[PDB]
RNA sequence: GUCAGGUAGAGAAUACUAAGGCGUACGAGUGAACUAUGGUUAAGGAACUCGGCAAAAUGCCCCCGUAACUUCGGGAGAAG
RNA sequence: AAUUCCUUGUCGGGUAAGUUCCGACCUGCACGAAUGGCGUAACGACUUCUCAACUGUCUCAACCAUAGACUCGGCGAAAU
RNA sequence: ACCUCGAUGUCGGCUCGUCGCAUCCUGGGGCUGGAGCAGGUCCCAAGGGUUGGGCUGUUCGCCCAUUAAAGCGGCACGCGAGCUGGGUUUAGAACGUCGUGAGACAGUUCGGUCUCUAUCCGCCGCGCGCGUCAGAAGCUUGAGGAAACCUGUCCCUAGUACGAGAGGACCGGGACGGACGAACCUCUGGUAUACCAGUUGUCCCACCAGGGGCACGGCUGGAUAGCCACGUUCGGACAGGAUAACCGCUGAAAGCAUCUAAGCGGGAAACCUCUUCCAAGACCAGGCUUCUCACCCUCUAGGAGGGAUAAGGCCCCCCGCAGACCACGGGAUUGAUAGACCAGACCUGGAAGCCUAGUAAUAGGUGCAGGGAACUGGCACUAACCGGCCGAAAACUUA
């Protein structure tokens, strides 16, 4: 359940180590953002000499959350590390390669690129 | 919070009459040949003699 | 042994267990106890469970009885004298009666006894 | 038109749809119901049908209810409810002594259940109306869970009759509308209402045809 | 007695192989990737099993790419078609939650030899 | 002001206990809200607040290793 | 600037966001050399900011045991 | 300065709301220097919503993400017998200035007790007594009140209408979103003070083993039941009647004209039904049914009084997810209402003993073993008892 002022790892090759969610989108006032939800964050720590650096506000899709997420068939999914992937302007993974797994919930729409880039699920 | 005015005699007695008691129901019991009144709650104990009768 | 579902009988926790243990001991020792209504009510199932353990007592049950009762003589008599005396009764060995209240605190008083038949 | 029957809330369970989707349902024992009385416009002034539910021995039934059931021509029951229809043309479909069962509802339909919600006793404002608790630190002087202010300084005088305050919640009649009837088992006269209906287990409830989606 | 047994047994699932928490197991789950009913394999260790009759569930933990994933499934769910237990587990607890902080040599569990 | 037992513990602190002294003076029940002391908690982890205010966090014995500065003692039990 | 009313003076750093904080510019209403001018190694239950952990302060509230509140028996005030 | 200095506690922040539209949006309409999207202006419309953070006490204001919106005001610049004390406005001390001085500076800076057991009205819920012309028991129409009224993304129409191009529709439908509220434990989690297992210190049951008290339930791994949300469903309607702005139809006064003077229409989240709840103390005290529908005594028969009864109710008692008490619901020997016992589901992890391998801790068969409270079905083994109290008709007029 990612919300405002929540730190979370980045799964990409953009240098950003961990970002900090600012506010959730897709609603007037959304408290939490589960798997497949886009949010705005700011790079708090990145690899020296990377594309993005500390202080650059960007957008990222919430994937690989920690809290349990229920499916339509009664199953549940939960990871051990709150992560996300920095998305491009409209809809695209900012980067070239993903490292950690991704939740199948991303398959809703417009995330086929991320689903194919993620080497799992 | 303190009483501003003096409660009237009627306003006092109307509620003071509520501070009453309810008499308990009695039951006739034959013990040692004599009949005596004991509530139904202690009726069972009256037969065995676990209820002192002054 | 059902939870009291509310404020315990004897002050705070860790005391109701000892109270029930002492009450069951006194009951199994004397054959009749006179206590408060709620105390006897809470003791009824405790005493019945102890009596069932005694009935089933062949081994490993003396330990279950001793982990709750401390009087060795009381445990011995409960295991020997009572023993199979209730081997035919399929439960309900403790009879509860209500008596007149005592002075001072108007606490409903009850009396527990062991059915003899 | 507006079908209806009385049942009992047994418990909630899960079922699986044809597409491998989980569905939480509630089992309602819509047992047989006897039609006792038919209130018409000329007799009372409205179209309604009285249904009975629950088994009861003839010893416990009361003499007035016993005489009423005798005049109706059926045996006594525990609970008695009444369903108010919309017209005499619809109320004419029911007759005294008729027996209704769970066959009156088909799979996939929508119903509106009515029951008596559970009782929570004297619950505070935070539990009654979802009030927002105050600060638990920074000097809170015994205001952790009370609402606090109540109205205007000196203009209103009264406290605007109808304010949300502490009291006894629950234990009132509630109606959950637009519940999907998953399945109807005729062998046992049971319905699988999609969702959670009000009322405790083993409590009487009234299922009726939906109004907004009937 | 499970009063609602007369409604649960109608949908209960048979051919459920015996399994306990701590035993290595792989489950085959049906998925639809763009109108294509395929079978995905998920291999791991059963960390718990909450008994609820028809609602009985079981969770499996798997380490992949240095990241742990806990997947919970209902035992009698229809989306499953195979639950193969590869090696039994010799554990003491009933809900192996403590495995959420072990890695590799520490996360290993014994087997019933 | 004087007696200073034992068990772990560096210890007259801490937990229990030997002899000794007490259950001390209103009591019995009731899962109401609420008042005050503790226990627990999925996710965020100071985002509440003027203010990390209160709780929590590091906390003990043996070792590797400890910066800027400095009046050369210290910082230092630094940190890890 | 515990000194500046104009002032949230201007630049750089910190946070995505800083009337707070640090250095500099000097336009010193109304700093200034024993009512001392420039800080200090160590230090302060003196004030402020930031940094890693941490937690119910908060999102967001939820339950458990105690003494009251609640019922019973006895005693039995109060300010107005 | 007209009550108030023999006391009306002053600014912000938290909880709590109430009311107006000079309306931020949602809704409708007129004019546009309105080709369309996107805009400017006006009229009606308050049913609903009107975010989270950094600065500074702050109100206010700036900035960061959004959002159809981050609206203006009254209610002692709402709310301290609800809270906070950050500042203002006590007592201490310092900076700069003022005065030879004690001291002062709507200049600054560090700190600086927030009292009261609710008397009456007001409010949230629950009882007692009586009335509804005999005592009651069931099912209900219902005046009159309470509850909700939010809204965004994408996909067809249609890359069509429009438009040189860029750009880009109204209307009509479909799918999916955020918030609020109701229900529930079915899934996931939080709580489990008589539940299971590991363990440090200590004492004890003579001693080993096995157990018990204390140190937060001593600490954790959990933990079925009730409750809860972080979990699952459900409400926002559709439709009908009359309207504000507006658009109109036939039409004179005034041979034409005109939405009006006589009439007839469309017209919005506004108004009333329509969705949920309460409601016959609604004193017009309601309506449809059923049971009892009969016994004595005194006053001097005018009426009244007492006693005893039928249905019914209540008292005592075992209990509930019903509950502060009260009250509600089930039962009471013609009974599974509760306690116990058996069995099932479920929780916990492999119990005491024997034997084996190991000098040793420890592991292995007896063992899905032992233990357990809420969930369920049987079983009268135990308690609902040989038991007590209230409780039923003046009469008269018209048809
Ligand atoms: Mg407090
Ligand atoms: Mg006031
Ligand atoms: Mg004393
Ligand atoms: Mg309590
Ligand atoms: Mg927490
Ligand atoms: Mg955590
Ligand atoms: Mg502190
Ligand atoms: Mg900050
Ligand atoms: Mg000076
Ligand atoms: Mg000096
Ligand atoms: Mg008293
Ligand atoms: Mg005065
Ligand atoms: Mg207007
Ligand atoms: Mg309306
Ligand atoms: Mg803030
Ligand atoms: Mg001073």
Swiss-Prot record, chain A:
Gene3D superfamilies: Ribosomal protein L14. Signal peptide: none annotated. It holds the Pfam family Ribosomal_L14. It comes from the Bacteria. GO terms for cellular component: cytosolic large ribosomal subunit. One of its GO terms (molecular function) is structural constituent of ribosome. Coiled coil: none annotated. One of its GO terms (biological process) is translation. NCBIfam families: rplN_bact (TIGR01067). Part of the 50S ribosomal subunit. Forms a cluster with proteins L3 and L19. In the 70S ribosome, L14 and L19 interact and together make contacts with the 16S rRNA in bridges B5 and B8. Binds to 23S rRNA. Forms part of two intersubunit bridges in the 70S ribosome. Belongs to the universal ribosomal protein uL14 family. This is Large ribosomal subunit protein uL14. It comes from Mycolicibacterium smegmatis (strain ATCC 700084 / mc(2)155). The gene is rplN.
Swiss-Prot record, chain C:
Keywords: Ribonucleoprotein, Ribosomal protein. The chain holds residues 2 to 118 of 199 of the full protein. Part of the 50S ribosomal subunit. Contacts protein L32. It comes from the Bacteria. This is Large ribosomal subunit protein bL17. The keyword Ribosomal protein applies. One of its GO terms (cellular component) is cytosolic large ribosomal subunit. One of its GO terms (molecular function) is structural constituent of ribosome. GO terms for biological process: translation. Belongs to the bacterial ribosomal protein bL17 family. Transmembrane segments: none annotated.
UniProtKB/Swiss-Prot annotation, chain D:
The keyword rRNA processing does not apply. InterPro entries: Ribosomal_uL3, Ribosomal_uL3_bac/org-type, Ribosomal_uL3_CS, Transl_B-barrel_sf. GO terms for molecular function: rRNA binding; structural constituent of ribosome. The keyword Ribonucleoprotein applies. Pfam families: Ribosomal_L3 (PF00297). Keywords: Ribonucleoprotein, Ribosomal protein, RNA-binding, rRNA-binding. It comes from the Bacteria. Belongs to the universal ribosomal protein uL3 family. This is Large ribosomal subunit protein uL3. It comes from Mycolicibacterium smegmatis (strain ATCC 700084 / mc(2)155). The gene is rplC.
From Swiss-Prot, chain E:
Gene3D superfamilies: 2.30.30.790. The keyword Ribosomal protein applies. GO terms for biological process: translation. It comes from the Bacteria. GO terms for molecular function: structural constituent of ribosome. Keywords: Ribonucleoprotein, Ribosomal protein. It holds the Pfam family Ribosomal_L19. PROSITE patterns: RIBOSOMAL_L19. This protein is located at the 30S-50S ribosomal subunit interface and may play a role in the structure and function of the aminoacyl-tRNA binding site. HAMAP family: Ribosomal_bL19 (MF_00402). This is Large ribosomal subunit protein bL19. It comes from Mycolicibacterium smegmatis (strain ATCC 700084 / mc(2)155).
